[PDB]
Amino acid sequence: KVDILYLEDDEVDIQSVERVFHKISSLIKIEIAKSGNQALDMLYGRNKENKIHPKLILLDINIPKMNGIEFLKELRDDSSFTDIEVFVLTAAYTSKDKLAFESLNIRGHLIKPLDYGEAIKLFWILQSM
């Protein structure tokens, strides 16, 4: 159904990421969650959100108001989401980030902007999944 669940609240980032993937394929389905709360609502199919089962979760960790760590902690405590692969997206991946995501089973990090090179890499992961 949904290939990627992108946690992002910056409208330009949303359009940019959707456009990059759209140029690769108009069939790559991306759903947008603008908060950790909404992402969970979509994964559980509650609060007026339709339940989705994404293969990958792309998390923009440069949003101070959106606690990605708390989201990931809750995500990883529910076995229904064990197979969802997670990639963090940031304009600056730090030593602190490295330490923080070590036990949250994150497949990798991506440096903004998420361009063709990064998107095609994700496309093949979707396929290989």
Contact 4, 57 (CB under 8 A): yes
Contact 11, 61 (CB under 8 A): no
Query: Which residues are registered as beta bridge partners of 109?
Result: 88
Query: Which residues are registered as beta bridge partners of 90?
Result: 111
The technique is X-ray
Residue owning tokens 């997670």: 86
Is 1-128 assigned to CATH 3.30.1490.100? no
Q: How many residues does the chain have?
A: 129
At 89, which amino acid appears?
Answer: L
Distance CA 100, CA 69 (A): 8
Three-state DSSP at 56 gives strand
| DSSP character at residue 51 | P
Residue owning tokens 């293969």: 55
Contact 61, 90 (CB under 8 A): yes
**Is the preceding omega at residue 64 within 30 degrees of 0, hence cis?**
no
Distance CA 39, CA 45 (A): 10
Distance CA 85, CA 123 (A): 13
Q: What number of other Cβ atoms are within 10 A of residue 82's Cβ?
A: 9
Contact 43, 51 (CB under 8 A): yes
